[PDB]
Amino acid sequence: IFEMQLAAQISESSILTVRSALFALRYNILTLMRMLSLKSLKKQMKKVKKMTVKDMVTAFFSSYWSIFMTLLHFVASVFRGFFRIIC
Amino acid sequence: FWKKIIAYQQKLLNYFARNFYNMRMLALFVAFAINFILLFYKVSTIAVHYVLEESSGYMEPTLRILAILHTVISFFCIIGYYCLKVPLVIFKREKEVARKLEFDGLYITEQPSEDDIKGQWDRLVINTQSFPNNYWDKFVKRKVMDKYGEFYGRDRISELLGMDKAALDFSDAREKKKPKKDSSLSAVLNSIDVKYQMWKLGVVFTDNSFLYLAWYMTMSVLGHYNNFFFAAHLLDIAMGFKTLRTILSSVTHNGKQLVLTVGLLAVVVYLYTVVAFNFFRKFYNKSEDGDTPDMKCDDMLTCYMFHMYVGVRAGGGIGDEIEDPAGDEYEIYRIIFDITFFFFVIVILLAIIQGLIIDAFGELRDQQEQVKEDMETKCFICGIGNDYFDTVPHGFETHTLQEHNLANYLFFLMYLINKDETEHTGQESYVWKMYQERCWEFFPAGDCFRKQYEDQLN
Amino acid sequence: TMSVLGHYNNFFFAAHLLDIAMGFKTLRTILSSVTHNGKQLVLTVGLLAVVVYLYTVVAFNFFRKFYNKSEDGDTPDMKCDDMLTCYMFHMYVGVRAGGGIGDEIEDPAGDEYEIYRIIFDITFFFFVIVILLAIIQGLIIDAFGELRDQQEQVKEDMETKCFICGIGNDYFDTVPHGFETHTLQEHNLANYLFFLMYLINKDETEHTGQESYVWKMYQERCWEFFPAGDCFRKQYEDQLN
Numbered sequence A: 001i002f003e004m005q006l007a008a009q010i011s012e013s014s015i016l017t018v019r020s021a022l023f024a025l026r027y028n029i030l031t032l033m034r035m036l037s038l039k040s041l042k043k044q045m046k047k048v049k050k051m052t053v054k055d056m057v058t059a060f061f062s063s064y065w066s067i068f069m070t071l072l073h074f075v076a077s078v079f080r081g082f083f084r085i086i087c
Numbered sequence B: 001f002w003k004k005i006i007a008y009q010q011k012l013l014n015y016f017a018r019n020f021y022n023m024r025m026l027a028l029f030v031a032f033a034i035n036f037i038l039l040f041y042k043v044s045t046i047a048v049h050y051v052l053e054e055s056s057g058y059m060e061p062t063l064r065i066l067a068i069l070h071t072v073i074s075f076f077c078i079i080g081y082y083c084l085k086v087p088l089v090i091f092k093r094e095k096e097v098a099r100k101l102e103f104d105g106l107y108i109t110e111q112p113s114e115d116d117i118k119g120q121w122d123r124l125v126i127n128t129q130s131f132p133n134n135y136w137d138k139f140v141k142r143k144v145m146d147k148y149g150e151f152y153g154r155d156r157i158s159e160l161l162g163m164d165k166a167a168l169d170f171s172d173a174r175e176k177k178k179p180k181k182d183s184s185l186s187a188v189l190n191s192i193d194v195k196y197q198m199w200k201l202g203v204v205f206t207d208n209s210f211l212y213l214a215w216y217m218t219m220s221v222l223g224h225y226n227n228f229f230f231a232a233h234l235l236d237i238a239m240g241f242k243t244l245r246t247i248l249s250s251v252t253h254n255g256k257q258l259v260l261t262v263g264l265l266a267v268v269v270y271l272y273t274v275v276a277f278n279f280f281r282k283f284y285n286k287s288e289d290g291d292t293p294d295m296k297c298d299d300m301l302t303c304y305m306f307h308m309y310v311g312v313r314a315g316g317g318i319g320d321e322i323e324d325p326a327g328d329e330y331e332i333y334r335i336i337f338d339i340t341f342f343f344f345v346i347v348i349l350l351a352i353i354q355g356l357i358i359d360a361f362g363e364l365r366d367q368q369e370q371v372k373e374d375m376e377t378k379c380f381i382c383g384i385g386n387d388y389f390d391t392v393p394h395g396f397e398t399h400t401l402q403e404h405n406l407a408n409y410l411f412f413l414m415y416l417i418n419k420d421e422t423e424h425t426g427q428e429s430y431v432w433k434m435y436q437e438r439c440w441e442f443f444p445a446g447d448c449f450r451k452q453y454e455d456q457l458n
Numbered sequence C: 001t002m003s004v005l006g007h008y009n010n011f012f013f014a015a016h017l018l019d020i021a022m023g024f025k026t027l028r029t030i031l032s033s034v035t036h037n038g039k040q041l042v043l044t045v046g047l048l049a050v051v052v053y054l055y056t057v058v059a060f061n062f063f064r065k066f067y068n069k070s071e072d073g074d075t076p077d078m079k080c081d082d083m084l085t086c087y088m089f090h091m092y093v094g095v096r097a098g099g100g101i102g103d104e105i106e107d108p109a110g111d112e113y114e115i116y117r118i119i120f121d122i123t124f125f126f127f128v129i130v131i132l133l134a135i136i137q138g139l140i141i142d143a144f145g146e147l148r149d150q151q152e153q154v155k156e157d158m159e160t161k162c163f164i165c166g167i168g169n170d171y172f173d174t175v176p177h178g179f180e181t182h183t184l185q186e187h188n189l190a191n192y193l194f195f196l197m198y199l200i201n202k203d204e205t206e207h208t209g210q211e212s213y214v215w216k217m218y219q220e221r222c223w224e225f226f227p228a229g230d231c232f233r234k235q236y237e238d239q240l241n
């Protein structure tokens, strides 16, 4: 009680890092989807119009490879921004 | 045709999701085989060359095949876990953000702390038309409307949640709907929710286990440029074997205390270095030939490095490695210096490290014993002691396996979730309403069927 | 077989000194201190081998020149010019060294990689010499403590609960020496063993009604005749007291 009263008497009257990470995420994911959200997909799929399980599996693997490369670019961008804000 | 390519893709996804763990084991085995082969890897000497030295001569192609297999298995171990554990992560995060919207007004009344990556990133998924894609509660937006619109405004909360105002009323007045074919061009492109996929990819990239798998794949790729990068995959035993994790928890349980002990050791050795540099400089000659002295404590940095690097590793401390003090005027002072260094650094601080590890062992064992005792002496749901039920023979076992089974409660929650709301009975409707309100008063607490009907039953 | 071989070579009789472990009860507590966590000990040794292999890879890729173990410069004796030799050198010398591999490889002062090799030696000493060996010591100490705790738990359970019915000692202790009387006269497990022997050795045609009932449930392996949460005192509590 004494120290509380004394304290009352005497009392008289990260963000950059998270923003850089968010920007890196947005930029890298936008770059990833800029090649999957356009109408050229028709002219690329004209060749794969045939059934060709081999080509379907190839494209299925390529999608995940593209995702992995996008994550690698995102991590590189995060490191670049973190060093830049260090300096 | 598209309905068949989707089926084939789903078959591949299911195969990888089923075989995620087996193939993680396969990757570990292939890494072990690669490193065992690398154990026979010599240097030839000009620029030195690294070459396999083997009488058999065929483990170079074997190593190449194993490296290719390891890279393929790592890629597949990404595709799996993407088909398997990513949905669970997405479900958990969707549930968390939906319940923080409903029960906390996170983006209505509170707003994120501006330093939380999760809170700041989750703002994207609110406006998406497919927000609760994995979470079962598809009415979270309507519930948020009901809870917060009357005070914070129908229109503004609808803008926040990305909902439509007049389209629903116009459709109710007149349906005005035309058929759509997904086999047409741009149909899938229009159907896919770009913003939701953005948020999902951000969550996946922020996920720790996915980052670890990506690092595993990157190291496997680098292993082709240099075969010794495959040694980095031997660190996967910690994350692969449960049994090693007890031994490693013996170290990581008091990791903060271990780091602080190392820092305290550094500070103490720095104090000893200051004393030696100010009083005992002449004893730090480490050259056998008197022609050229090699003074190790003529500089603060060199003297501190000498101490930290030599005295700590020495069995008897710094006195094992500095000049004998006999016959000197400072003989007693340097004897005290050496004895105190040996006692405080070599004997006590290392004992602190050993005691931290031993105490971690004991604490983990005690925690497991406490879990066992609590589970064997109290019911997990109601919390009544085992003796009351044991008044009837096998009473506690019967009560915990037939009456208050947590597995049965989980099954009931699953049954309610999968059952149509319009088909609920009275008790089911009551429990469902309190579950949606997140009120846990229907769980018995200190009471049970036997306690309430004790007179009639017995 | 070892005794027979001892006649061909008298030193095969030394193999019979291992019989002390299986002959003396007292040595078995000390040996259980080791065998209680034997799987964890083996896994710790394997983890040490893996860590030393990683250190060997690093040294072979960056610190080869420091592994000359020949005093004469005429003929070098390079111990880490091969993966297998470098790994054997590490596992055999650095682990047994008090200060780690740095006690036995060349001094790094004046080299471009001085800081890197200092970090190498310090981390080797901390992780291998200090921590993993501490893990072994802690495993042994924890085995001691766990065995002692198990014995204490056995003692406490036997002193606080009846072995047959499981009723706590306080209820019987309401009567002086009640728990002792109940556990030595009423619910004696030795008495139950004697009763089982008596039933087995007694002719089935001479069984009484209670004996026939217990014998039938014993042959059916139904253990409902053992009191569980009930006793003579509990059932006749009103009349007896």
Ligand SMILES: Nc1ncnc2c1ncn2[C@@H]1O[C@H](COP(=O)(O)OP(=O)(O)OP(=O)(O)O)[C@@H](O)[C@H]1O
Residues within 6 Å of the ligand: B375, B376, B378, B379, B380, B381, B396, B397, B400, B401, B404, B405, B406, B407
């Ligand atoms: N509400 C409860 N539901 C279930 N078990 C309970 C509950 N309350 C206490 N228990 C006790 O918890 C223990 C559950 O045993 P446990 O889960 O270890 O066995 P299991 O189902 O055979 O499988 P596992 O050993 O693999 O977990 C039992 O001793 C049981 O009496």
Ligand SMILES: Nc1ncnc2c1ncn2[C@@H]1O[C@H](COP(=O)(O)OP(=O)(O)OP(=O)(O)O)[C@@H](O)[C@H]1O
Residues within 6 Å of the ligand: C158, C159, C161, C162, C163, C164, C179, C180, C183, C184, C187, C188, C189, C190
């Ligand atoms: N059903 C039971 N039958 C016998 N003892 C019981 C029973 N329930 C509890 N106990 C307790 O177990 C203990 C048995 O003692 P203990 O067997 O150690 O002694 P002992 O017969 O003299 O021989 P020893 O010490 O060599 O085993 C006593 O403390 C007794 O109260």
Ligand SMILES: [Zn+2]
Residues within 6 Å of the ligand: B379, B380, B381, B382, B383, B384, B399, B404, B448
């Ligand atoms: Zn219960």
Ligand SMILES: [Zn+2]
Residues within 6 Å of the ligand: C162, C163, C164, C165, C166, C167, C182, C187, C231
């Ligand atoms: Zn009893």
